[PDB]
């Protein structure tokens, strides 16, 4: 036959040694990529911080943690925070930012942990829920549609809900997918939560299974600053994968995870929307409200 | 032609996922197999801690972390410690223990960086030299001749010398090679370091390349307590290689590495060693001390 000899299993570590693609050109400019964002917005600092002031919640859970930028902020701002992500890699980056500042009281109550949508109930003791449970940069269109049915979808929601104590939040949101899809492009640099100082170019491939949107991948092409000769930038790149979540969909999504037992309102990039506005949003926010 | 679409580039990571090969057969086995190495050796901790003292070593640099349990053993014994290591999922053990007990005072103190032994110089600021640098574990072996000749082993051999003061030590050590070499098999459970409580087979492949010993590859086949039906055992494997190292062949590498001016000595499982002596080590440790 024809056999294939490994130096050593996918997914194993050896002390010593870089783990196995943490050096690709991909994972180099996914390092300068995830670290161009985290320039709060004036907007989305405001829109947030007011959101959980005005419904006076303390106790928060961030379920999208990443590199802990919007966590970081909630832990200043005076709120007790819980931080849970899957991704290694990225808590990598909050993990270090809490030990800088383990020194602050603050930073020293500040628990990030490790979990899953899957399995989010066994994996974080909800206690009696949470006032407020947090998912935003477009966080949940990351998780793909593997068996075809959004039960996985349904799975993570109904998990997520279920850490929202009643007449809690939960302030979820992805990106309009639904102007995406129909023009097949999604502009570059449309961040409403974090102004990139990073410029770059996006290659946007749709796949249709049968009549059925399936993926969005988009092929970041970031342009490094001086990796060219004479000060000169380089161009890099790397892609990343997106499921195709539309306002309608999605909408029936999260309110079926609260057994339709809630409040449910969608904001248009930061203000209210309003379907046939002349408004195109590039995200949009669903603020929900555990009723019952 | 025929292309490959890849979801999302080798490397990168995203929020609410988990990382690409971190739910393996064999990343599981792995994880299992590096948490049953942590039941340090009475032998161990009395060779290691009194040459230390004795020696009058207070300063040490541990730069083959892993999960931190030679570190935290001489973060425990009262040392001043800084360990690196150039994998992020080992040493993700090593930052979760320092947090758990950043309430003891020595925990707090504790120091855990990335660096790689060829770029050691430019990861971790020397200073004026350590008393101590540690290498334990057959860690060295790690590290593959990508080049043909040593010379990646060469450049990471001075760069770890270089992190010596004068009068300092160096510490680190190789199984012996040569035994497995003319034997072919690698002995399973003979850990000087750590007695091991799980049951495992070993399958050795060694691979020559033009009549020089290249690698040894090491196919673990790890008996996983319950994961059978009524209570039976399950089994996985997982492989990791390592460099051949012979005792005269390394001898040579690490006196070179100071120069000759230094002082060399290699033990054979902590006791002296001569050769031809009828006893067969299964761990070579040399024990440098930086005379120039």
Redesign the interface.
Same mark, same amino acid.
């Given at each position: 036959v024809d056999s294939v000899?490994?130096?050593?299993?996918?997914?194993?570590? &050896?002390?010593?040694?870089?783990?196995?693609? &943490?050096?690709?050109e991909? &994972?180099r400019v996914?390092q300068l990529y995830?670290g161009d964002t985290r320039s709060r917005t004036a907007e989305y600092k405001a829109w947030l911080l007011g959101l959980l002031r005005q419904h006076g919640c303390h106790r928060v859970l961030d379920?999208?943690?990443?590199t802990g930028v919007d966590s970081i902020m909630l832990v200043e701002e005076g709120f007790s925070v819980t931080s849970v992500?899957?991704?290694?890699?990225?808590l990598?980056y909050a993990?270090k930012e809490r030990?800088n500042r383990?020194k602050e009281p603050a930073f020293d109550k500040w628990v990030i942990e490790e979990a899953?949508?899957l399995t989010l109930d066994k994996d974080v003791p909800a206690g009696d829920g949470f006032d407020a449970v947090i998912?935003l940069?477009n966080?949940?269109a990351?998780?793909?549609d593997s068996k075809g049915d959004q039960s996985e979808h349904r799975l993570?929601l109904k998990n997520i809900a279920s850490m929202v104590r009643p007449g809690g939040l939960l302030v979820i949101d992805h990106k309009n997918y639904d102007y995406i899809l129909s023009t097949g492009c999604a502009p570059p640099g449309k961040n409403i939560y974090y102004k990139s100082d990073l410029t770059k170019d996006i290659t946007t491939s749709v796949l249709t299974v049968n009549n059925k949107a399936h993926?969005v991948?988009l092929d970041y092409t970031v342009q490094v600053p001086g990796a060219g000769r004479d000060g000169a930038p380089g161009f890099s790149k790397?892609?990343?994968?997106y499921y195709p979540h539309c306002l309608a969909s999605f909408t029936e999504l999260v309110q079926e995870a609260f057994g339709g037992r809630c409040q449910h309102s969608v904001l248009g990039d930061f203000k209210p929307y309003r379907p046939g506005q002349a408004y195109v949003p590039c995200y949009f926010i669903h603020v929900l409200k555990k009723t019952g």
């Open positions: 000899y490994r130096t050593r299993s996918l997914g194993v570590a &050896a002390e010593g040694i870089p783990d196995q693609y &943490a050096d690709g991909a &994972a996914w995830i379920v999208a943690c990443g992500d899957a991704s290694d890699k990225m990598k993990l030990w383990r899953n949508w998912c940069g966080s949940f990351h998780l793909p993570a993926m991948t790397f892609r990343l994968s």
